[PDB]
């Protein structure tokens with residue numbers, strides 16, 4: 001089997017991407033944030049505290065003939081940006097772009113933090129990291145991908161995020177028309193439950209390539225590119241007027257600037273992020289100070305190849321018994 005679904009930026013800055021997902025019988029379609037950095041599939045629901053729902057589409061398990069309460073199961077998660085959610089668990093039929101999984105754990109939110117409430121466009125998350133990170137207790141549950149894997153033509157999914165444009169998540173096959181040149185594969189460590197890999201280095205603009213190992217995770221659920229302070233300092237030094245602002249919470253730059261590109265290494269291959277991808281606009285409405293798309297990972301504890309990096313590439317998440325990651329230009 002295979003599946004193929006379009007993923008769409010939630011706003012003009014590509015702050016996140018939503019993908020339609022069919023849940024239950026008859027189908028209830030929710031727009032979920034596919035997140036390769038976590039492993040819970042959770043949704044706004046009829047059980048969510050009413051004051052914490054503001055425009056989202058909710059899942060109503062009582063209206064699904066295939067929904068079953070997973071007795072005694074609860075979940076609770078907190079993300080890297082400080083947001084959180086929690087609730088109980090159903091199993092139900094879940095389909096993504098024509099690919100169907102029966103008995104998928106659908107985690108129903110009873111509580112969500114303010115940032116989820118305030119984002120009307122995101123109806124929940126669909127985690128695509130390794131199932132070892134799943135927070136369901138007392139019986140850990142599998143991700144949609146892990147459940148589908150045995151049925152897929154090939155045990156892979158691919159992320160093809162667009163810049164200011166729609167893109168695609170495919171399951172079970174590699175679309176050889178979706179990228180240029182070849183796909184370069186690189187080793188993955190699953191020791192922390194992430195799609196963790198080691199970049200071979202970087203370049204700023206037309207500058208010389210610096211060979212240096214940068215361990216980080218491929219994370220579709222994170223907007224920005226978070227890298228070591230040395231690397232990030234080297235990037236923003238090439239932008240006149242750029243500076244790190246503690247009050248804003250990272251590097252900002254004059255909106256009149258032209259940003260240089262940023263290149264990262266995948267083995268001997270190179271992925272180039274155009275400068276425009278690194279612009280996240282005025283820090284507040286009307287401001288001439290703009291927020292940068294490359295930020296320091298110093299306060300995070302891990303380097304994160306988020307959407308800023310990933311949308312410059314066609315990315316293969318290979319879930320073979322020894323998982324690997326593939327990157328191609330596009």
Ligand SMILES: COC(=O)[C@@H](N)Cn1cc(Br)c(=O)[nH]c1=O
Pocket residue numbers: 015016079080081082083115119122221222223224
């Ligand atoms: C809800 O999405 C957002 O607020 C975006 N800023 C993407 N995002 C979402 C989560 Br959860 C996170 O830990 N980091 C992040 O960049």
